[PDB]
Amino acid sequence: PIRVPDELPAVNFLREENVFVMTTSREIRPLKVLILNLMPKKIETENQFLRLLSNSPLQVDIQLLRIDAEHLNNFYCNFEDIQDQNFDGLIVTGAPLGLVEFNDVAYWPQIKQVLEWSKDHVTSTLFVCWAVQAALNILYGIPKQTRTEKLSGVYEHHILHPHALLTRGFDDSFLAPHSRYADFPAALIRDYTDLEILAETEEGDAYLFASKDKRIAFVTGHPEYDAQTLAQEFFRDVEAGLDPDVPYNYFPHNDPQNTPRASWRSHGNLLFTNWLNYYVYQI
Amino acid sequence: PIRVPDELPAVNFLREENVFVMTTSRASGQEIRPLKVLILNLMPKKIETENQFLRLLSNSPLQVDIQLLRIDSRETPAEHLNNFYCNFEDIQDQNFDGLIVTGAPLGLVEFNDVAYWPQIKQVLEWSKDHVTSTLFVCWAVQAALNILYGIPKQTRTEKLSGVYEHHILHPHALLTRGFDDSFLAPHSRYADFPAALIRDYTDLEILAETEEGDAYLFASKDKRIAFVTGHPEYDAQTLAQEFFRDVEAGLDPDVPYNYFPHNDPQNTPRASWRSHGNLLFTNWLNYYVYQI
């Protein structure tokens, strides 16, 4: 935050827009961030999250958590290894569990254990994609909701709170990618949770939402994705004989031979910078 | 920056995209000292300009101690300048982490005829030894291209006024980190900034261009100087207020390009360039003023 003279007009003006300002009148520590990686492609997923978390002057000490091979043995800790530690941040990734009932998810008990533990041990937890479905069940009792057809593509969103911290810097309307069977109706989520809805798709899905105490935050797309991530899912779904739809608004001229761009990069960077600055660190 | 195990694949993979990564075996902390940032405000609307730049500089966990520098005594919100601005002589003997030199209404004014030209040259000569990184905005780019590189004033035949398409040139550059390949930024300038010509005369890195080949962003490899030729600090309404002022002055201006909904000046403009103004100033503070 800036430090300016007490009477500078900016003090009251920026405070009115929810900007913290220090004045001439009136500590630094490494942050501990745990990542619970449930994604099938562990290394790609590590690279995507750690790129966004490295874009900060804050020292972010990363611990990788497995729910429960050489790569995992070398770089990941188990829950028991860290159950006595406190963290400034926890990221729970997505997982390919859109079509799986909670009671058929092999490690459902271990996920419940981590989320119940986060209540006392983690300042701010961020839930991504399927982890939102999981957290809405375990924290708020909301049943699994499933769409008829997969949402796969780069969608138009709008912000709801001009002065909100988590959407600080965001354009009034912006792109973010989705790849999910999970359904996330915003009006229903608001009713059942009283969480603040910070961004929505044009069709009324919740994209971003969080608690006013900043302990929990939810993102239902994949703004951490590389340009090519949805292309790889597509070609995989083709070769598996699922006969998928081309992801929406993704390939130049909707031709899968053309090179996709990361048209959603900007608001992924803003999201993670905002999460670290205002939720994990807390100005 | 992150700290990860030494052999984690992300270490070599992120270093290859120009991302600084620390490891178990080799790491250092965030530097604890507050940053010192000086703003040379040459804009006519002193308070609106303070609010716009201070909004972007406050969006950071880094403590940024701000000093406001006036270039002249000449009278103007006279009392505001007396209460809140220092003179050059007040900060002559100090070092700063950053200096912003704002734009100014001097696009149609020869350098000869700029009352405070000697004070501008004085500050830019002083910045070489006293400021880690200096950012030049809008007309200040024209001033700095003349004073640092001997490039004469280039002037467009018509004012560039509006919200334009740009592209980045360097996917892994620090100053454009997080930027989309294509993005919006506003311009309000008579000054001409052909990118190919500026690259020839300066050897600066061109980091973003407009679609008509103007330089938008460029910087020195040593990080001592950076240049932005538009106004990403502008509020939603700033271009509208310029337009209404110009019509009132009987200049009968064109509507700013791609700005008013339906191109109708009775409609409420949005800040469609907010995102990349935030990324720019966050990147300037993190990688140029602070230096990860």
Swiss-Prot record, chain A:
InterPro entries: Class_I_gatase-like, HST_MetA, MetA_family. The keyword Lipid metabolism does not apply. Changing R180A: 3-fold increase in Km for L-homoserine. 8-fold decrease in catalytic activity. GO terms for cellular component: cytoplasm. Substrate binds at K150, S179, R236. Induction: Contains two transcription starting points, P1 and P2, which are 74 bp apart. P1 is under negative control by methionine, whereas P2 is independent of the intracellular methionine concentration. Keywords: Acyltransferase, Amino-acid biosynthesis, Cytoplasm, Methionine biosynthesis, Transferase. Changing E224D: 3-fold decrease in catalytic activity. Its main location: cytoplasm. It is found in: Cytoplasm. Homodimer. This is Homoserine O-succinyltransferase. It comes from Escherichia coli (strain K12).
Curated annotation (Swiss-Prot), chain B:
Substrate binds at K159, S188, R245. It is found in: Cytoplasm. Pathway: Amino-acid biosynthesis; L-methionine biosynthesis via de novo pathway; O-succinyl-L-homoserine from L-homoserine: step 1/1. GO terms for cellular component: cytoplasm. Changing R189A: 3-fold increase in Km for L-homoserine. 8-fold decrease in catalytic activity. Its EC number is 2.3.1.46. Disulfide bonds: none annotated. GO terms for molecular function: homoserine O-acetyltransferase activity; homoserine O-succinyltransferase activity; protein homodimerization activity. It holds the Pfam family HTS. Inhibited by iodoacetamide in a pH-dependent manner. The keyword Electron transport does not apply. Changing K45L: 6-fold increase in Km for L-homoserine and in Km for succinyl-CoA. Slight increase in catalytic activity. The active site is at C138, H231, E233. The keyword Protease does not apply. Induction: Contains two transcription starting points, P1 and P2, which are 74 bp apart. P1 is under negative control by methionine, whereas P2 is independent of the intracellular methionine concentration. Keywords: Acyltransferase, Amino-acid biosynthesis, Cytoplasm, Methionine biosynthesis, Transferase. The record marks S188 as: Important for substrate specificity. Changing C138 to A/S: Lack of activity. It catalyses: L-homoserine + succinyl-CoA = O-succinyl-L-homoserine + CoA. InterPro entries: Class_I_gatase-like, HST_MetA, MetA_family. Belongs to the MetA family. This is Homoserine O-succinyltransferase. The gene is metAS.
